[PDB]
Amino acid sequence: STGSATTTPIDSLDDAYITPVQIGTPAQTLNLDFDTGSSDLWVFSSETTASEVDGQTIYTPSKSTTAKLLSGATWSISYGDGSSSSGDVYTDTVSVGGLTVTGQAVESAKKVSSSFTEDSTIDGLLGLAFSTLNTVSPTQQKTFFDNAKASLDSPVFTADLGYHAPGTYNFGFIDTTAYTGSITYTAVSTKQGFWEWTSTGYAVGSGTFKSTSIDGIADTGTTLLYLPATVVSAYWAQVSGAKSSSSVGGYVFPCSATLPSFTFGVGSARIVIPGDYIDFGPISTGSSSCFGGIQSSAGIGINIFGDVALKAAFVVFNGATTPTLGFASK
């Protein structure tokens, strides 16, 4: 089997991407944030505190003939950005782009933090990291991909995120028409539950590539590219007027600037992030100062190849017995 679903930016800056997911019988379609940096599938629901719901589409398990309550199970998650959610647990039929999983854990939110409430476009998250990070208690549950794996033609999914445009999540096959050149594969560590790999280095604009190991995670659920302070400083030093602002909370630059590209290494291959991908717009409405899309990971504890980086590539998440990551230009 295979699945193929279009993923769409939630706003003009590609702050996140949403993908329609069918849940239950008859289908209830919710727009979820596919997150390769977490491992819970959770949704706004008929159980979410009413005052914490504002515009989202909710899952109503009592209207699904295939919903089953996982007795006594609970879940509770906290994300990098400090947002959180928690609730109880159902299993139900979940389909993504034609690919159906029966008995998928669907984590129903009783409570969500404000940043979730305040984002009317995201109805929940679908985690695609390793199931060892799943927060369901007392018994951890499997991700959509884990559950689907054995049925897929190939044990893979791919992310093809668009710059200011829709893209695609495929399950079970590699669309050889979706990238240029070849896919370069690189080793993954699952020791922290993430799609963790080691980049071979970077270049800033037309500068010569610096060979240096950068351990980090491929994370579709993080907007920006977060890298070591050395790397990030070298980048913004090439942008006139750029500086790190503690009050704004990162590197900012004049909105009139032409940003250089940023290159990261995948083995002996290279992925070039165009300068325009690194512009995340005015720091506030009407400001002539703009917020950078490459920021320091210092204080996070891990480097994160988020959307800014991933949308420059066609990315293979290879869930074979020994998992790997593949990157191609496109």
User: How is residue 231 written in tokens?
Assistant: 């790397």
3-class secondary structure, 232:
helix
d(CA 267, CA 240): 31
Q: Are 38 and 79 in contact (CB under 8 A)?
A: yes
DSSP letters, 298-310, are TTTSSEEE-HHHH
Please determine, looking at this structure, whether the domain spanning 5-174 carries the CATH number 3.40.50.720: no
Q: Which of 95, 199, 261, 297 is catalytic?
A: 199
Domain residue ranges of the chain, discontinuous segments joined by +: 5-174, 175-330
Tell me whether residue 46 is one of the annotated catalytic residues: no
CATH pick for 175-330 out of 3.40.50.1220, 3.40.1440.60, 2.40.110.10, 2.40.70.10: 2.40.70.10
Instruction: Name every residue whose Cβ is closer than 8 Å to that of residue 171 and which is 6 or more positions away in sequence.
Output: 2, 3, 4, 96, 97, 99, 145, 148, 152, 156, 157
Q: Which of 14, 33, 35, 123 is catalytic?
A: 35
* Residue among 187, 165, 164, 161 at smallest CA distance from 315: 161
Give exposure, 194-212, as e/b (b: 16+ Cβ within 10 Å).
Answer: bbbbbbbbbbbeeeeeeee
> 184-188 contacts: CB < 8 A, separation 24 or more?
184/266, 184/267, 184/268, 184/269, 184/326, 184/327, 184/328, 185/267, 185/316, 185/318, 185/324, 185/325, 185/326, 186/266, 186/267, 186/324, 186/325, 186/326, 186/327, 187/324, 188/318, 188/323, 188/324, 188/325
Resolution of the PDB structure in angstroms: 1.6
Tell me whether residue 199 is one of the annotated catalytic residues: yes
d(CA 330, CA 326): 13
d(CA 324, CA 318): 5
In CATH terms, are 5-174 and 175-330 the same topology?
yes
Phi, psi of 91 (to 5 degrees): -115, 145
